[model samples]
Target: HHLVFIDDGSTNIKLQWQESDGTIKQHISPNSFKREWAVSFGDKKVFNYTLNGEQYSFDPISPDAVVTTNIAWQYSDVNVVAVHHALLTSGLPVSEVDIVCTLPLTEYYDRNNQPNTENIERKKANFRKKITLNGGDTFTIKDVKVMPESIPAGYEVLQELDERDSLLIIDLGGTTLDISQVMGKLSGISKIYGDSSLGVSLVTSAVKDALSSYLADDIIIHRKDNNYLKQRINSIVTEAMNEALRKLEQRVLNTLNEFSGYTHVMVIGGGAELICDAVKKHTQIRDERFFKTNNSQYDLVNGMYLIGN
Candidate 1:
């Protein structure tokens, strides 16, 4: 069995999977798009693309893998090839694989299945598809399980806590902030409280775009660049949107202020770490019970791994 959560973020991608050998691990990045090219003519060693006129010997960025929101991109395009890469890296046999992933909370509304709660109403469904890697090999996706994005983390977070307690789950994701009021399980959901009006992802976008402009043609970067990776990203955000993120902090505190009565405030997701310290800034939150999962980035994928197994 293998668990894969392809967190298609606005500015990043989180790929997590487990090996059939019972070892679990995660791989993540702020920029998932590597050097990919649209080939007019190419060889294993080099390729030529049309945009740079097939003459400049350009190392083009992958267009399909992007800071994008193609709703079904998780299952198609070059991203599927990325998935195949992760699976093989994790040592999972592509044969007879069991996979699990999460959809946006808004997919509930899209499903037109307005129930009392926002837990994944439909678990596993047929997700069979053919994944062809350009002119290379092919693989089959015979089945898949889809869970609601936010509440899966709760199955892990609520461990050891009183199961019947009133709680607020602040799932700050890259694309959306899923705020849910929980009394226990899925049926105990009281409300989902988050909106784009307070979404802090825009700050990340602002920073990304601004940094891209600042880096311009001179910067030939790669993931292998080590702490330069962290330094570059941190420096970009700090310089471009430090004040904007601070205001976002205020909005987070304001949101928490309204739900002060919950027994615990559980924070998880890609944006969780980004929003958490601000969560700590409030004395009231400091006084209350709060928990943040380690590797706040991998929380959802880790939770889904448990669900998949």
Candidate 2:
């Protein structure tokens, strides 16, 4: 059986799968899609597909495409569309595939620490269907496995940890922050905290609004702004982002204290850079207790691939 792992995040999609040839393949793309009749595709190849009865044109380079950030994002048509687009762009065989996906820690379990069956099932049902491309091409999804987001990331580093140590994972994505406490040596998770209410987006919007109002021109912060404007924007963004980072950092510290027994820390996700200072600080005091990842965005999916295989 072919196994595929899709970590469809709010900002980017991280895809990895194992082929029958026993080789692993991967692809990464932004989590943006446009639902339109026709979009101009100048100097770019467009990927058009029909997902959940809606036609979507996906261009990872589109500057102003729509992205889903709702609390119910995992159970929506937009997410389904994005997942399909990632698979299509991956250039992999998608038919009769067993796919592994994920949800933020908060959504994966209930208050009583039981798996949230309703949310999980709803998310699974959303993708267990067919996707059609522009031509007479189609792919079928055989089974959809949904798992907790941050915990799987730990699996990627399981062998490095001692059997008696407890592993803690701080997953900071675009829309949510998840802190999970799991036992090392492939045990299970003890507790998971945090929510979708906190993410890097808070600082992003705050900086965007502040910069736009400062210029009095309502401009989006682009990569190559005027040097003077860039300097001013950098300072403004630094102040705003640090303020948000301080709060997140404190929250993680507080959770660390609350959990009380975590011996190893793993920080992973697209937004990990935002709070790397605090994460590094915590690790510096304890030296070798932290597991660093070169590719933070795909940490979750890579771990999920292990579980799927």
Candidate 3:
């Protein structure tokens, strides 16, 4: 069976799969798409896809893209198209494949710590239909298995450390801050705590607003990257980032303060690199006791692929 892992995050899509020769292939695509009625450019770089009888222009940085970071995003048509865009860009010739996908910690589990079947079923059924590209090329998603987003990463960490060690896996993604408290070893996860409402976008959004208000002009900063504008308004960017981190620090403290049973605190996901220092400083986690994944963007997808194999 061909196993494919996809982490269709709010800001980016992380895809990974093994080839016939045992080579692992991975790709990251911006989870943004522009919906257009008709194409005007004859030599466009991106492809236009048809889903549910509607056409949408997709690219890594599409203008006026339809992107969502909400809990209900899994049930939307845009999410399906975005996932297809990532799969197509991989150039994997996905005729039929068993897929593994993920949802935020909160959506993946209910209050009673059981799998949220409703959300999982919705996500699985989203890819059950066929998605066609410009030239009528289609991919069929044969089967889908949905897992909790950061939980796998926690498990992946366990393999690297002592079996008796516990951890607080902080997944700071684009739109969700998923924290899984792994107290047990590879056998099982004793408890987990998550907050999907928080994310790195909060800082960027604050920076955008602060810069625009400071300049007294509307600034057009894409959510994908803010480097261009950051160069000019460095002070404002720093202020915004610090304030955002300060607010998030409180939440982190609450989680870490109560849990002294864990050995180390690990941070992963797209924003881990950018927000690692703040987490380290606020939680007072020493260098040796703290862990952060530099390949934060693909870290979750890599973990999922590991679990699949």
Candidate 4:
């Protein structure tokens, strides 16, 4: 049996798989470098991906502007490349493969499971279709398993701590903020909230807004398109990340305030430790006894395989 993981994150695809030695991993992030394909693949006129340690990506063919929405699924071909890469790393052949991935809480919380039933199925089918890579390789997905972002991460926390206390999980990703209240039976309308509704993009835009003096006017119009600004602002990028972290913290606290104190709080995702580092000592989160994953981002897919068995 083969086990593969895919967390097509907001700005990147976080993929992983088990190996005899340890865990193999890869992250494919957005690139400003423009790539011209010999021939386009169907409607994927422009593409976003990283190749051989070099960044090669561009805005979608539709919009001429630079944009990085939490719409990773919009580019199904990206996920295809991710699966093929994971299989390659694991010494597995590039054939039909089954894998695991995640959806934001709001998308996964539908009463009729409509998102999973149709919209998700459609995307999965699209991802499963054959696609050619930048380096002239091809691959396909055979099957997939889906999980809400926070639930599985919380499961990992609970399993590690060996406690079933009322758990509050916050998955802060580049594109969305996933909040899930995990319990014995975590089925409810609001079990998890946030499906691109709240995310790092909100903060990044604000960060751009903060740099009114340094950045050019045209570039500020779109985030992904501003490669020029990234090179210049590389000096203060960490400041921007911290600034975004501060804004995200306020939103997290606002959303989490009214609820009763949770027994254990697991904050996991891209730059999760920043949240923990800044607010782990906060009265509400700190009281939960602070359970975290060494691999903050991978915990979702890691716990995925954990609970999947």
Candidate 5:
């Protein structure tokens, strides 16, 4: 049996299947990740489970292979579950099949001068070294291409006059945000712009602080509350969102001041929805038409899958 693994945060979902006689065979969906498993097998029966007292389910299996896709704004539980399942499935002695797994490029480089160019390259080097040291040659490591850092091809094309110009890609996630810039072809490496910071989490925390009185003992305002607490939280979240946008605009403007004709801003990630309008209002670029937006939630996973294929 061959297994394919895709790792998102929070939980991982895995797909296992077997192919014999040179033809693709039946595939099995054992959605065993997340806090709960709501996936069904052949019938509509649900397999529900809880991890650490947290309940979750795996439901609605429309595709033959188990697929886990998510937005870059939130934690990726699917990717984590798929990779773990692949490892466990490979241990079984039922059949000898190739195992393929894709991991994200969460952190670029360590504090040291360690190379963090490509996710696949890092995986191959780390795993291959271990395999060779352990005298195991049965398994091979494949290096798939890394996903576009923040700017997808569509957005890149929208910003013309490439290669020489510097492209700023700001990826806004739920808890963290990254600002990176690429100076050459899309294939070339990107330089880390400035310090990465808490973008959305700041907004969420601001909301929580604004309504501390109505919060539960655990500090969680119930999702179904209709009290003054909810209004306060909303106000605080909005304030934080605006503040973050202002900071982003200032940083971009300052970064662009040094370069004479290199001004292309590409906004992506989940928080982009909240901050893009503000950025357009502040920046003074001749080609305001070049400012583009992208949906990066599934871009990374899709890009990784394409590279794997």
Candidate 6:
């Protein structure tokens, strides 16, 4: 009888369950985030399978259950079925559960940017119809409200640097390379100029393709045994990292006009380290001032949790 949160990211699904002791238990799976599984306690004892690829022992005296929240990225139809399936498998008499989800902010903007009010209305109507067909009720969808005025806690760190001059925020993630400019004060409106076509997955894919040649002989032998491929794959991955960093530096300089004004640059997100060396060489910013995060992966998620609290 406690609140459960399932944070479905593009590459992984994380579940956090609040315990009676005021602490929390967390689990994650590196599968498609949109997929859901069921846990049950039977006679009052629900027996369920944990992702360890094994079943959990159940006791009737302590009935417990946990399941995926079935949220999807970009508000797709595939997500609706995943959540509904998980609910059906739960076998609980439900009233309601407070579900938290994240939707694509960019998609919302694209939908609203119709030429005129009439076109905008038409797009909204079509979008709603699609949602209804996909099993999403009107109440199910909620935007991850990004308060324009309220900056995240780390805004202070960025702000201190902002006072010196403009700074570029290079957010390289699994799906996208989001580059933006934070001007004036950190709390002020950060202008997201645009994003590039490069992404971490692309880098990974490039590595795989490069290794395919050298790996052809080994790959043929490993058709039955497939361990050596991993080492070769890592080598290709490093090469891809170098290429991605070169592209990132070039894209930033070519697209943004006043790059010289910005004396400091902050690289964040999972791919930050992979491209940091190349980024440093291309920019005039001093090595000491080039910002990189130690916990780049959790920064955005933890920032949002703090903001919500």
**Model 2 quality (TM-score):** 0.79
Question: How big is the positional error of residue 138 in model 6, measured in Å on the Cα after superposition?
Answer: 19
- Would you list the C-alpha lDDT of every candidate in the order shown? 0.55, 0.72, 0.73, 0.57, 0.42, 0.43
Ranking by TM-score: 3, 2, 1, 4, 6, 5
Q: What is the TM-score of each candidate against the true structure?
A: 0.68, 0.79, 0.81, 0.67, 0.47, 0.52
Which RMSD values do the candidates have, in order?
A: 7.0, 4.9, 4.7, 7.9, 11.3, 11.3
Ranked by TM-score, the better of candidates 1 and 4 is: 1
lDDT of 3: 0.73
Instruction: Determine the C-alpha RMSD for candidate 4 after optimal superposition of all C-alphas.
Output: 7.9
* Pairs that clash in candidate 4: none
lDDT per residue as tens, model 4, 46-127: 4434444433344323233234463544444444444454444444556555777776665554654334555566556655
Q: Which ten-residue region of model 5 has the weakest summed lDDT?
A: 128-137
Scanning candidate 3 in windows of ten residues, the lowest lDDT window is 212-221
What TM-score does structure 1 among the candidates reach? 0.68
Question: lDDT, candidate 5, residue 114?
Answer: 34
| Highest TM-score model number | 3
In angstroms, the error of model 6 at 281 is: 3.4
Q: Tell me which residue pairs clash in candidate 3.
A: none
TM-score of model 5 (CA atoms): 0.47
Clashes within 3 Å, all models in order? 0, 0, 0, 0, 26, 5
Tens digit of lDDT per residue, candidate 1, span 87-199?
A: 54444444546566556665543434353143343323224423434343433454666666667677765554565775577877655566777775444665666564545
Clash count for candidate 1 is 0
